[PDB]
Amino acid sequence: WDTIYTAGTPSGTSGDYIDDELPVYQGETTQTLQDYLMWQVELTPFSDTDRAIATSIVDAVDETGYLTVPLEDILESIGDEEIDIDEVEAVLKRIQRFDPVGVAAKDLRDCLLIQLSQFDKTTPWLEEARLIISDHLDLLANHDFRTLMRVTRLKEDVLKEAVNLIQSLDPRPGQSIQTGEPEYVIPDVLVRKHNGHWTVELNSDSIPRLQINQHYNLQDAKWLIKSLESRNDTLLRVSRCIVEQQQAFFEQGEEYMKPMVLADIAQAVEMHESTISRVTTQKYLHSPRGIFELKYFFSSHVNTEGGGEASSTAIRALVKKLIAAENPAKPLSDSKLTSLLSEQGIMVARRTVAKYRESLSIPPSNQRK
Amino acid sequence: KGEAIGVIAAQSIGEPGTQLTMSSIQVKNKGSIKLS
Amino acid sequence: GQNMRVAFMPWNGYNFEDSILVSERVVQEDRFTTIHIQELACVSRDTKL
Amino acid sequence: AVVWDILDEVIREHPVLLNRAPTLHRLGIQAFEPVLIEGKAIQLHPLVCAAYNADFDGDQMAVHVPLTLEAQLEARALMMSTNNILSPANGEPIIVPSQDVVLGLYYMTRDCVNAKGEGMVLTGPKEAERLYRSGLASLHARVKVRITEYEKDANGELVAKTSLKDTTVGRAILWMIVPKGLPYSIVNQALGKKAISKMLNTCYRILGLKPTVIFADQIMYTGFAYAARSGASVGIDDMVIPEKKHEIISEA
Amino acid sequence: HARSTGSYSLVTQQPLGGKAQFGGQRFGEMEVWALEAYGAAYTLQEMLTVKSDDVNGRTKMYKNIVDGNHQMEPGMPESFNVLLKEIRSLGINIELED
Amino acid sequence: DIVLNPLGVPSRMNIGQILETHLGMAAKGIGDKINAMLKQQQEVAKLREF
Amino acid sequence: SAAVKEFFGSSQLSQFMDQNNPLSEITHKRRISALGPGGLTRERAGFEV
Amino acid sequence: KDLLKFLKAQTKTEEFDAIKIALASPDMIRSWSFGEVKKPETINYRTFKP
Amino acid sequence: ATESFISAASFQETTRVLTEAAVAGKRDELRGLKENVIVGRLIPAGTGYAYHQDRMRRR
Amino acid sequence: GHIELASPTAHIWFLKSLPSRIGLLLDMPLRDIERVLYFESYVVIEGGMTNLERQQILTEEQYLDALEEFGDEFDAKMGAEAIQALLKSMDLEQECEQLREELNETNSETKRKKLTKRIKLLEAFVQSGNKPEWMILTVLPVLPPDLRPLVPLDGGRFATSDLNDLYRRVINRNNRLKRLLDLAAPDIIVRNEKRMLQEAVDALLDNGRRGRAITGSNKRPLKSLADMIKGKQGRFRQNLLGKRVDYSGRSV
Amino acid sequence: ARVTVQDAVEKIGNRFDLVLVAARRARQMQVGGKDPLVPEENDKTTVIALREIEEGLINNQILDVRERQEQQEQE
DNA sequence: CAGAAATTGGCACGAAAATTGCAATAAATACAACGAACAAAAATGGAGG
DNA sequence: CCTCCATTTTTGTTCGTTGTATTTATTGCAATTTTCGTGCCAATTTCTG
Ligand SMILES: [Mg+2]
Numbered sequence A: 001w002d003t004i005y006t007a008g009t010p011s012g013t014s015g016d017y018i019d020d021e022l023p024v025y026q027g028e029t030t031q032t033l034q035d036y037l038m039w040q041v042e043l044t045p046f047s048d049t050d051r052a053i054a055t056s057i058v059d060a061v062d063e064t065g066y067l068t069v070p071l072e073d074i075l076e077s078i079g080d081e082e083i084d085i086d087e088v089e090a091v092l093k094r095i096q097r098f099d100p101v102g103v104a105a106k107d108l109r110d111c112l113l114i115q116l117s118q119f120d121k122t123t124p125w126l127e128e129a130r131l132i133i134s135d136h137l138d139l140l141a142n143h144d145f146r147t148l149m150r151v152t153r154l155k156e157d158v159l160k161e162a163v164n165l166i167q168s169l170d171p172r173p174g175q176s177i178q179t180g181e182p183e184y185v186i187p188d189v190l191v192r193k194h195n196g197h198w199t200v201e202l203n204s205d206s207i208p209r210l211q212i213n214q215h216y217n218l219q220d221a222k223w224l225i226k227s228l229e230s231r232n233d234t235l236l237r238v239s240r241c242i243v244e245q246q247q248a249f250f251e252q253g254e255e256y257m258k259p260m261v262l263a264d265i266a267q268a269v270e271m272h273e274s275t276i277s278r279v280t281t282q283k284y285l286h287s288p289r290g291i292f293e294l295k296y297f298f299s300s301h302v303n304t305e306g307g308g309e310a311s312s313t314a315i316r317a318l319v320k321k322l323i324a325a326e327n328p329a330k331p332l333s334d335s336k337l338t339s340l341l342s343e344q345g346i347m348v349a350r351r352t353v354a355k356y357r358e359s360l361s362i363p364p365s366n367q368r369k
Numbered sequence B: 001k002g003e004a005i006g007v008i009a010a011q012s013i014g015e016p017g018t019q020l021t022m023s024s025i026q027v028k029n030k031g032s033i034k035l036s
Numbered sequence C: 001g002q003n004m005r006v007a008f009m010p011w012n013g014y015n016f017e018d019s020i021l022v023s024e025r026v027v028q029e030d031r032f033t034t035i036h037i038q039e040l041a042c043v044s045r046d047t048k049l
Numbered sequence D: 001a002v003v004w005d006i007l008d009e010v011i012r013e014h015p016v017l018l019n020r021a022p023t024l025h026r027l028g029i030q031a032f033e034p035v036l037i038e039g040k041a042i043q044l045h046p047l048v049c050a051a052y053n054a055d056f057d058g059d060q061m062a063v064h065v066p067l068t069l070e071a072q073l074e075a076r077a078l079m080m081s082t083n084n085i086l087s088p089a090n091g092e093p094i095i096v097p098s099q100d101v102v103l104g105l106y107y108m109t110r111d112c113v114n115a116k117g118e119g120m121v122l123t124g125p126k127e128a129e130r131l132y133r134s135g136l137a138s139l140h141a142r143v144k145v146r147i148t149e150y151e152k153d154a155n156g157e158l159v160a161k162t163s164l165k166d167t168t169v170g171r172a173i174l175w176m177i178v179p180k181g182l183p184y185s186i187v188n189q190a191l192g193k194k195a196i197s198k199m200l201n202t203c204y205r206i207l208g209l210k211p212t213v214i215f216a217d218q219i220m221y222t223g224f225a226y227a228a229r230s231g232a233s234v235g236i237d238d239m240v241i242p243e244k245k246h247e248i249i250s251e252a
Numbered sequence E: 001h002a003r004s005t006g007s008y009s010l011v012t013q014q015p016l017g018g019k020a021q022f023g024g025q026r027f028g029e030m031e032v033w034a035l036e037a038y039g040a041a042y043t044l045q046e047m048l049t050v051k052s053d054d055v056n057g058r059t060k061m062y063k064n065i066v067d068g069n070h071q072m073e074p075g076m077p078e079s080f081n082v083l084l085k086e087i088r089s090l091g092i093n094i095e096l097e098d
Numbered sequence F: 001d002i003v004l005n006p007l008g009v010p011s012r013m014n015i016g017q018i019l020e021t022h023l024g025m026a027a028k029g030i031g032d033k034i035n036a037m038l039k040q041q042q043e044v045a046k047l048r049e050f
Numbered sequence G: 001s002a003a004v005k006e007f008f009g010s011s012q013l014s015q016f017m018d019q020n021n022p023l024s025e026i027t028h029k030r031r032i033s034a035l036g037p038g039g040l041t042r043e044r045a046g047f048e049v
Numbered sequence H: 001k002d003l004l005k006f007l008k009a010q011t012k013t014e015e016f017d018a019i020k021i022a023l024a025s026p027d028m029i030r031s032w033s034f035g036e037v038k039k040p041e042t043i044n045y046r047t048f049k050p
Numbered sequence I: 001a002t003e004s005f006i007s008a009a010s011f012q013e014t015t016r017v018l019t020e021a022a023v024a025g026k027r028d029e030l031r032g033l034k035e036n037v038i039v040g041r042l043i044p045a046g047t048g049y050a051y052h053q054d055r056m057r058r059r
Numbered sequence J: 001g002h003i004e005l006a007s008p009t010a011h012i013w014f015l016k017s018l019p020s021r022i023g024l025l026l027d028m029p030l031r032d033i034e035r036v037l038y039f040e041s042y043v044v045i046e047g048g049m050t051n052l053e054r055q056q057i058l059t060e061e062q063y064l065d066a067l068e069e070f071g072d073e074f075d076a077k078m079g080a081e082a083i084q085a086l087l088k089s090m091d092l093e094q095e096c097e098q099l100r101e102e103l104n105e106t107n108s109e110t111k112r113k114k115l116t117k118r119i120k121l122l123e124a125f126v127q128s129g130n131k132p133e134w135m136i137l138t139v140l141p142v143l144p145p146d147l148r149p150l151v152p153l154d155g156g157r158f159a160t161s162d163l164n165d166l167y168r169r170v171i172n173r174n175n176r177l178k179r180l181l182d183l184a185a186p187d188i189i190v191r192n193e194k195r196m197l198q199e200a201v202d203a204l205l206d207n208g209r210r211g212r213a214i215t216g217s218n219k220r221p222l223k224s225l226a227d228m229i230k231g232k233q234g235r236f237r238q239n240l241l242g243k244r245v246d247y248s249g250r251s252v
Numbered sequence K: 001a002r003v004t005v006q007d008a009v010e011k012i013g014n015r016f017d018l019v020l021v022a023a024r025r026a027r028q029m030q031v032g033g034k035d036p037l038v039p040e041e042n043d044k045t046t047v048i049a050l051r052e053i054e055e056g057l058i059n060n061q062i063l064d065v066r067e068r069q070e071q072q073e074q075e
Numbered sequence L: 001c002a003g004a005a006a007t008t009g010g011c012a013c014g015a016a017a018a019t020t021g022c023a024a025t026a027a028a029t030a031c032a033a034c035g036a037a038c039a040a041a042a043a044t045g046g047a048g049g
Numbered sequence M: 001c002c003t004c005c006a007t008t009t010t011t012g013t014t015c016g017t018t019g020t021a022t023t024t025a026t027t028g029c030a031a032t033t034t035t036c037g038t039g040c041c042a043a044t045t046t047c048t049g
Helices: A033-044 A047-058 A071-078 A083-097 A109-117 A126-135 A147-152 A156-166 A218-247 A245-252 A262-269 A271-281 A312-324 A334-343 A351-361 B005-019 C024-028 D002-010 D046-052 D068-077 D100-108 D125-134 D170-176 D191-206 D212-229 D245-249 E029-038 E041-053 E056-069 E078-088 F017-040 F044-050 G004-011 G021-029 H003-009 H026-032 I003-009 I012-024 I035-039 I046-058 J021-026 J032-035 J060-070 J080-089 J093-105 J110-127 J162-183 J187-205 J225-229 J235-240 K006-012 K015-030 K045-053 K060-074
Strands: A190-196 A197-202 A284-287 A288-294 A301-304 A310-312 C007-008 D016-019 D029-032 D061-064 D142-152 D159-170 E025-027 E094-097 F001-003 H016-025 J002-010 J044-045 J075-077 J137-139 J243-245 J248-251
Touching: A033 A047, A047 A071, A047 A083, A047 A245, A071 A083, A083 I003, A109 A126, A126 A156, A147 A156, A190 A218, A197 A218, A197 A245, A218 A262, A218 A271, A262 A271, A262 F017, A271 J162, A284 J021, A288 I012, A310 A312, A312 A351, A312 H026, B005 C024, B005 E029, B005 H026, C007 D212, C007 F017, C024 F001, D002 E056, D016 K006, D029 D046, D029 D068, D029 E029, D029 G021, D046 D212, D061 E025, D068 E029, D068 I046, D068 K045, D100 D212, D125 D170, D125 I012, D142 D170, D142 J002, D170 K060, D191 D212, D191 I003, E025 J248, E041 E056, E041 G004, E041 I046, E041 J243, E078 E094, E078 J225, F017 F044, F044 H016, H016 I012, H026 J002, H026 J137, I003 I012, I012 J110, I012 J225, I035 J235, I046 J032, I046 K015, J002 J162, J002 J187, J021 J032, J021 J080, J021 J110, J032 J080, J044 J060, J044 J080, J075 J080, J162 J187, J187 J225, K006 K015, K015 K045, K015 K060
Parallel strands: A190 A284, C007 F001
Antiparallel strands: A190 A197, A284 A288, A301 A310, D016 D029, D016 D061, D061 J248, D142 D159, E025 J243, E094 H016, J002 J137, J044 J075
């Protein structure tokens, strides 16, 4: 028996679908950040040249609200040789005060200064925060609080109030306009533990209604009927082989995935490598650990001194585990990492460990203290 | 001049549409008799 | 429904063409007050990222 | 709190278009000047419902806003409800009283054989109104009133004449809203729907459009007031069955 | 329900329908006939162009109204261009001229 | 509590509402007599007799 | 199971219960319809039916 | 080019006096087109782009 | 059976009208109310009447 | 865009819309032309010097007998190419003059009306810049994509609409016919492919007018281009004569 | 002019020409910066134009004469 | 504050692996219910000479 | 016995007013591009003198 759901979200529809004819799909319009910006541009007393500059500027704003090209690019894109750069700067300054304030900023310091320029002068710790942002913004990034205190010539309490005021601002002003809705994915194959071993089964969300129109032509569709069956068969076989070979990844998580490639599955299932590369792309499986693309289980390898091979994902997981528990007073350099993984039988280089650390987005040793 | 009278006539005729469903001579009053 | 004390007469054009004139005491006593309930749902899912 | 003052400023002389579906003739859309009210329902003038074929048992209306100056002037000059008192299908008035207004005007312009205050002589309509409001004379009492009426001349001017008329209190009271230029025989009878339509048509043909709107509004107000004052009701004893019904049925 | 401006259809570029979608009121053939019978040409041109599916006219009318200048600069509705494309997809050459 | 127009009765010919109004008046009068007896506490014999 | 589920959940004569008041439910449960599969249609039905 | 004229060109409205309808030659149909369609495939689901 | 094929295709039998018009190579002059409603111009009646004459004097 | 058709295909509007323009121009009955178009019978394009004349409708066995008797001395074809050859070779002014002479010589009523109608069609074709062979399709226009959008679903996937389905069917048939023709397959197969391509194009242009409507997953007919154009849900009546507007509301 | 436009219609003759004349004058007063010839009493320009037309101070001939005079003066 | 170690990462090297266009690809029992007016064109019957 | 006219049969077009959706089919090569680990050296920062 297939598991029956013990809870669910009652369906939104509450009608009897009586009408036998409904129109074709057309869609609606959406208001993104740039639509709102242009709507504000039109209702502003600009000029023709100013409106052209504003159009070119708003074209360059990204999803976070940050300008993505230098002002020289915009000035070139205007295409008129009488226009200087100060006019572009003035138009940019005017645009930067549109709702939300701070949009179309060159960098973080500029956005923070723009936001602080709008607060009334009676805000208590305004000058101190302005000085911190304007002059020394990376000493705050290092969480130093002592060299910054040695330069700003201030006591502890004023610095704490200024930091709290600075961190109450918005670093990404353009994310307020939410035109998007979180989209999701539908798993195609579900993996569950039966008799202590993991077995796979196709998702039953598809359309298995095998029907024909014998009332009146369907010979061509008879071939598509079995084309769908072939697709289901190949997907099921490939996923079954992947799960059978990876019985230990599900049981104990990562650090135990095997170093498999397309050729292994191609030999196992008796199909060309290209077919395996096509099936296992943008198709997902759901496990009690999460949703994973079938491509996730193919990985490289490094030589193991014991005579075997170690997958790169296992080494990445080991690097993550080691770095997560390093010495807080003095963190670990990759030279230390290559030594710790050496004694375990993993024979990797040092630059490879640095590459793995970079892929995981982990700051270097000096930045982790 | 410029009045659209065809539309006015058509509406005048069409508006009351829903209200519609779907051996001898004896003179009645005094007067001279005319034949033609 | 509810039992209402009623009179049949024209009152200054406020019951013209099937209109109804209602006392303020009817409103004060919450005789025709109704309760409406609504449901909303938030679903925490799992995705690729 | 200031946006409501702004809103009162912008809608001051800006018309809107009211439309009820289905639109069977051109009087299904009409232009009005808005008055801001509370609540969530649109208020409609009683005299225009017949044009819309509308009643207050669940009907809905749509409202549209004209934007440019030409549209606003077209609404004020072509589509406003004060320009649409005569039908385009025929020449009869369409903005005419009905129901409560007709019942009240009919009730006040009637006579009773032996009513309180019968046989008096009054100096004019104001004395009749003063007697009625004091309880000293019935609305249906047959009295004699000094009436002054005006008639248009060959060159187009009003000339007056005053005489003692045999009438009732209610007709003399109603005579105070009739504009100058109409004869007194227009109200010296029991008024029904056809008589009131004839009176409005005569006012339009003799005096023009501007006095006719004022006359119609005054008629509506007076009819509502006196229909309220009469206390007319319906009971089970009002449906009187003849005594001969049984014999006729038996013989058949 | 009431509306001044909102979201539009993607193919016809006209306001959507229903209260739950913040839609507009339909101005069908019979309302057009009533306006023609009155003789209100400018009101009808406002209904057809700058309030439903003339996009540049929509934006310029909104800007003019906010600016205090009640005047429109009408153009061509988008649905007529869609009609021309659909007719030309049938192998029939229909076009404007002069 | 409510005022209704009498002009909606004769053209619709739903005479049931007038009779219902009369009978509801009668029932409320009976209830008023019972309530008046109950307020000025009287003997159960009078209550059950009425 | 697919056929049974389809019949009970997405048929013409399977409808959300009318639930304004008890009388609505009682009236809904005692209703007879000439429409549906194997029946007439709202347009091409006739006049004498 | 010039961005001002480029932007002003895209709001220009055609001026016409009449509508003319006729049959379409193969040359006219080819002159409308911007290319030829050869595959019946709409969207590449493996990369999410046409 | 009018001289405008737009005003006839709007009413009934679009396929037949369009086929006949395409075969005959008809030309539409936009003189009625329906034609000007289709293209969103001013109708040649009422307040638009005085407009159209102007154009008809420059053609 | 456009699609290059491997074989000529007739436009269904100019064939199956009564009266048939192709049949009226060729003076051939509709059923014979439908038989020739759908690969059932042969027509003689050039009479040559044998007994065969213009527009004679042979059959399969009759064509075989003609091949074995008269050999290579004639020209007979079937399908849209035959009708295109008939239309292309035909002249207009000479036919007009001969029809006028025949009309003014004989005296009748029915044949006089028929000849008058044919003369009118010929004169209309001559006055316009059209050529009759344009009533057979060789290149097919393709609608802009944003006027036929896909239907998004849950999970970031799309479903094809009706116009896309019809276009896909046409493209598949055209590709298969092109591959077969380049591969030099036997005639009894290329003719079947040609017939199916003709049916697919006819379904795309006007679905259900000829034969039976092709349905989709919902056992309901697909929407062709004519369905977009015409009806109570077409552009004219649903979008161009009435539409939804801004600055509007409704209430009780 | 606030309720009926009968006097303006009588002055101009045609109800369709009255709209055009009033729209031209109202656009002059609203955008062109001209001053009303009657005492403004918290009226909109659409009503001020009709009140001017009622008094006989504005019609098409007067507007054309003033336009020619102003153009010649500015030249 | 100066003098080099320890650290990190950009750039590059061969070599394995993942990713693309492009011709070749089959056909097995059930499928539905009910409309009316009206006009134009076609198929056939029948009669004047 | 032929044409031609009238008559019955066949086919086509029209009919008051909202509702919420489920699509992709593969499969075997030869070429191409992408990515892998790891070296090299140069700039960084870090500790000691
Ligand atoms: Mg009602």
